[PDB]
């Protein structure tokens, strides 16, 4: 059936693609396959799957094919790229002027890799005020160079000057920022014109929404935007799932990745380098105060009675933590100083009262991630309220403050268990293994976020266990979204499960992915389906010692028994503070 | 020896500049945050097309320009080359805002 439509597109529209100068047969036709590492390769050696996918892309562009790479971080995609380019100058002898573009964050280290590898051939970078620019602008206007490296800023700016010159190959990095259609990169390339070849990268490919595949892929070939509008029909319907997108798109869509097997490489560190010790994964529940519920119920009304722009405002603030507008506390406590009821108000707090102490008693270092970093504000002083050793960082902490603080908490002896973060902003790329423990107050709100929140710790070199620790309160929207993007947690592993056979490029993969898949959904509908911290005490053992001594933390809070758990009423501020929340 | 122009020479040279130039001279945001901040006080939570706000920034900036030039006259008529609040509140006092 529709596989034959696929085939037609394959042969003919491929012919048109190569004019623009399965697929697997016809896409791989042009034969250059080299398992060597090239000559000038210096200062380290591949993990030679790197040779394999290397060679794969080699054939791509020898097949006259651009590419898109899904590879996991820590595999030195950097090198792979580099050595590739070196090869182009090198055995290909092409010496083509090649554009490389990265986020400003890492460009330092990328330069560093030119150092460790190919000072043998030039680079050109850009940053640092007009002067350096106009200088090296003369350099490229001089035309002499080997590599030209930059970030997106001066792409925007000098892009006219850049576009002046013709181009052979063109590299694009963190290419999932191409995620968005009108993110100016693409169209500014239309004006900027183009290089005969191109490449896109991603650490993690993105939402199964999949314009994700489109903007990228369409941008790889004209065939891909027109055909992938016919696949605007197809993928508009890409997901009666068992009647369409489950039983069938095994065939249809999992064979659309079988379509994309010539078009993609992905790899798995813990399959190859396989140094991940473990991560042990949990989510739990909490109560929310009568304010945070009963009033929040009345403040559901107040969501419609600001109290407005509900989701991020109402739902997430209140359903997270209190006095976001502070009349809560102040009206209640004018002294505004830390006190009892800060632990009481949102169950996450009193929880922290029930866990963080044991963390200390178990001495295990914690990194956490947040949104609207203001919540973490409470955290500081909440911690102060016991006076606990901690650090904090947010998206607003400055660059070298960041690098510094990294080193600081990274002190092997650092008295800080708690170094607390903003998810995407503070996180960026990092590996901090001086912390053995991870905790989460918030949704994924797309997975890759808290996937970073996973990949800070147990990325290569953290061999201690990993408790993945989530707070979703009973009868809350974080439940809702939780299983929304957590659907995506079965959705990512699903079409991206197709990515998970195509990674290795072999079908036996997808054959494990059969019940990986269907078993996953089994779990998903086990969700068709209130915690006393006793049980938690019994789940927190990374050894049985932890059990004993923490149960004796409960000797302590046992015999000295600690007030009500939640804020539960007061009642004058019910009506009055209700109407002041009724705005 | 350093190069410093006689006092006020700068000021004049600007006045040439500004009179010779069109655009709104007040930063967009602060003006806005102010505006919304004000509108809070009547009925909350009101979307504002950028255009409308632009208009307000017109009416304001122009309005000021007037108020200066007059208050300028006032101080002149006091034989003082620098304005002082009494001069303002005088000027508004004549336009009757007071």
């Amino acid at each position: 059936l529709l596989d034959q439509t696929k085939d037609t597109r394959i042969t003919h529209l491929l012919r048109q693609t190569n004019a623009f100068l399965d697929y697997y047969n016809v896409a791989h036709r042009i034969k250059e396959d080299i398992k060597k590492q090239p000559s000038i390769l210096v200062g380290g050696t591949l993990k030679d799957y790197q040779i394999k996918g290397l060679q794969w892309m080699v054939s791509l562009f020898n097949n006259h094919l651009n590419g898109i790479l899904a590879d996991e971080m820590g595999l030195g995609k950097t090198i792979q790229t580099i050595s590739l380019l070196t090869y182009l100058y090198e055995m290909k002898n092409i010496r083509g002027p090649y554009l490389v573009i990265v986020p400003l964050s890492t460009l330092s280290n990328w330069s560093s890799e030119f150092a460790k590898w190919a000072p043998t051939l030039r680079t050109i970078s850009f940053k640092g005020s007009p002067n350096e620019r106009k200088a090296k602008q003369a350099k490229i206007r001089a035309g002499e160079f080997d590599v030209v490296l930059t970030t997106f800023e001066y792409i925007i700016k000098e892009r006219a000057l850049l576009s002046k010159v013709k181009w052979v190959h063109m590299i694009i990095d963190e290419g999932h920022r191409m995620k968005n259609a009108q993110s100016k990169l693409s169209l500014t390339l239309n004006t900027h014109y183009h290089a005969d070849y191109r490449l896109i990268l991603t650490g993690t490919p993105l939402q199964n929404n999949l314009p994700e595949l489109w903007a990228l892929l369409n941008f790889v070939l004209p065939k891909i935007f027109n055909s992938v509008k016919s696949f605007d029909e197809w993928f508009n319907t890409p997901f009666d799932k068992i009647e369409l997108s489950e039983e069938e798109t095994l065939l249809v869509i999992r064979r659309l990745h079988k379509v994309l097997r010539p078009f993609l490489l992905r790899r798995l560190k813990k399959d190859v380098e396989k140094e991940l010790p473990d991560k042990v994964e949990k989510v739990v529940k909490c109560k929310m105060s009568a304010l945070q519920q009963i009033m929040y119920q009345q403040m559901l009304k107040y969501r419609r009675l600001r109290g407005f722009n509900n989701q991020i405002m109402q739902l997430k603030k209140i359903c997270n933590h209190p006095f976001v507008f502070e009349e809560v506390e102040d009206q209640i406590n004018p002294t505004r100083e830390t006190n009892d009821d800060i632990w009481r108000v949102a169950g996450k707090f009193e929880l922290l009262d029930r866990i963080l102490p044991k963390l200390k008693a178990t001495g295990h270092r914690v990194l956490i991630f947040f949104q609207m970093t203001q919540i973490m504000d409470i955290m500081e002083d909440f911690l102060r309220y016991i006076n606990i050793k901690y650090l904090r960082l947010d998206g607003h902490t400055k660059s070298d403050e960041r690098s510094e603080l990294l080193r600081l908490f990274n002190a092997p002896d650092s008295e800080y268990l708690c170094f607390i973060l903003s998810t995407r902003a503070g996180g960026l790329g990092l590996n901090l293994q001086t912390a053995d423990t991870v905790i989460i107050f918030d949704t994924d709100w797309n997975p890759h976020q808290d996937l970073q929140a996973q990949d800070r710790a147990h990325r290569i070199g953290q061999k201690n266990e990993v408790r993945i620790l989530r707070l979703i309160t009973t009868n809350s929207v974080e439940e809702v979204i939780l299983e929304r993007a957590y659907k995506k947690l079965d959705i990512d592993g699903k079409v991206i499960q197709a990515g998970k056979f195509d990674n290795k490029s072999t079908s036996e993969e997808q054959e494990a992915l059969l019940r990986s898949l269907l078993d996953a959904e089994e779990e998903r509908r086990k969700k068709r389906e209130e915690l006393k911290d006793s049980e938690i005490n019994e789940i927190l053992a990374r050894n049985d010692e932890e059990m004993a001594v923490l149960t004796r933390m409960d000797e302590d809070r046992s015999k000295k028994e600690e007030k009500s758990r939640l804020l539960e009423k007061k009642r004058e501020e019910s009506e009055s503070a209700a109407v002041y929340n009724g705005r | 020896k350093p190069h410093r122009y006689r006092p006020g020479t700068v000021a004049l040279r600007e006045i040439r500049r500004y009179q010779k130039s069109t655009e709104l001279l007040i930063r967009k945001l602060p003006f806005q945050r102010l505006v919304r901040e004000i509108a809070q006080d009547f009925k909350t939570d009101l979307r504002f097309q950028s255009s409308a706000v632009m208009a307000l920034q017109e009416a304001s900036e122009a309005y000021l320009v007037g108020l200066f030039e007059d208050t300028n006259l006032c101080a002149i008529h006091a034989k003082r080359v620098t304005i002082m609040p009494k001069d303002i509140q005088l000027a508004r006092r004549i336009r009757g805002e007071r």
């Binding site: - | 006045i15 040439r16 009179q19 069109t22 122009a62 002149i76």
Partner: protein, 107 residues
């Protein structure tokens, strides 16, 4: 029958039809005599001619084939009659006429 527009029959550029229409909707009088709309429309046309000519000249001052509001502000504020007319109204993107108080000029 052969129709043609009154504005054509006035040899003028403003659609007296449209004008008249606006008049009636304007609730001005319950009735409208046919001379009014013509007479008015012409008036407008004259006005526009005035302001346009003056401004466009002011554009030629910088020899700018296109007219910008700055020009408008300038020409209008320059004339006595008009600036008298419009003194109660601001022009967008106005700027202000070159203006200096004598006392502040140096020796």
């Amino acid at each position: 029958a052969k129709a043609k527009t009154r504005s054509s029959r006035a040899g003028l550029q403003f659609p007296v039809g449209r004008v008249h229409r606006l008049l009636r909707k304007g609730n001005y009088a319950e009735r409208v005599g046919a001379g009014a709309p013509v007479y008015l429309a012409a008036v407008l046309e004259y006005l526009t001619a005035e302001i346009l000519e003056l401004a466009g000249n002011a554009a030629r001052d910088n020899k700018k084939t296109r007219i910008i509001p700055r020009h408008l502000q300038l020409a209008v504020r320059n004339d006595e009659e008009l600036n008298k007319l419009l003194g109660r109204v601001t022009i967008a993107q106005g700027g202000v006429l070159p203006n200096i108080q004598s006392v502040l000029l140096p020796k």
